[PDB]
Paper text:
In non-spherical bacteria, the actin homologue MreB is essential for shape maintenance as depletion of MreB through genetic knockouts or MreB-targeted drug treatment results in misshapen cells that eventually lyse. Here, we demonstrate that MreB from Caulobacter crescentus forms pairs of antiparallel protofilaments as revealed by crystal structures, an architecture unprecedented among actin-like proteins.
A single mutation in the intra-protofilament interface (S283D, ΔCcMreBdmh) renders the protein monomeric, as shown both by crystallography and by EM.
Numbering used by the authors: 9 to 61, 68 to 347
Write the structure that this text describes.
Amino acid sequence: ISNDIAIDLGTANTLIYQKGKGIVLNEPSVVALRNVGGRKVVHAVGIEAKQMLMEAIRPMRDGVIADFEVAEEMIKYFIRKVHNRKGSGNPKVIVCVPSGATAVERRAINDSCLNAGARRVGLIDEPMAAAIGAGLPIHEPTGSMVVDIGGGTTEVAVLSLSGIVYSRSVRVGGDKMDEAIISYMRRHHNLLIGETTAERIKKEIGTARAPADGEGLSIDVKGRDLMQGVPREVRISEKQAADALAEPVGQIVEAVKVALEATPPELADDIADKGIMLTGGGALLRGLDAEIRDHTGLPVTVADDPLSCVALGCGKVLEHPKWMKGVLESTLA
Ligand SMILES: Nc1ncnc2c1ncn2[C@@H]1O[C@H](COP(=O)(O)OP(=O)(O)O)[C@@H](O)[C@H]1O
Ligand SMILES: [Mg+2]
């Protein structure tokens, strides 16, 4: 029985695919730090940390390693958590990393896996894993565009010839959408709300396009009054949430358009045929596909299972390592 794993080390969520088992771990990429005698201690990791949240730290939140020690501890914790005692002790590991990850960041990730016992580590770039999981024909000379909207980043890439031809990331994704909602409630309604409430609003009435409709549906939002601090409830409409999200949505649209203008022709025309493939959790924002379509004049398809696409692509590379080439940049023990 195998301990080989592929890790989607996301800005917001970490997923681990295990050989012969599938996705065995899907947890937020968060650590709870405790202050003990002026020292900071990694007290809890993942869903256990989120459930007890001490200071919250998301060490990968912006698509770069913010805290190396904490990121390493988080990686080791997750690897240890999925380890099977009755399985091999020296597994092969794949980790998905952002395209712009630096040598130092990549070395840190490789070392984390080697220090947890891996006999070999291969790194794969996020948009390649996303394309593979979305089922894009990244072997053909046909141009493909994938737009992966995650937590702290959106990555856009043009693929062909088993390779990335263009890639660019911007620090706008689902986190900035939540922050926009938090900011809207504070400035427009004098109401302090937390990330959990912001995410519920985004999922329930959040949308990339205002209702022609008028104001659309509405929900009740519970928070604390800004000046007072007393619990207060405020009704918010789909129109209002659309207003709140307009700015980060606009920045995601701009990222796609910037990528398009930088797309080396020939490839331009291969794109307007089958369009753009959206993946990542951020792609689940209602109407974002239509909004991108309307402002690029390009067709837009949302990948099946956009939250899991990267993990499933990594898993496919893990299971069928002969299927493709040098998608992996590898390091042995
Ligand atoms: N139904 C939904 N509507 C809008 N956003 C969503 C939905 N479900 C999840 N998300 C968002 O997806 C983002 C996480 O996407 P993910 O691809 O896991 O990011 P990363 O790979 O960077 O960790 C979060 O900001 C989360 O709020
Ligand atoms: Mg991701």
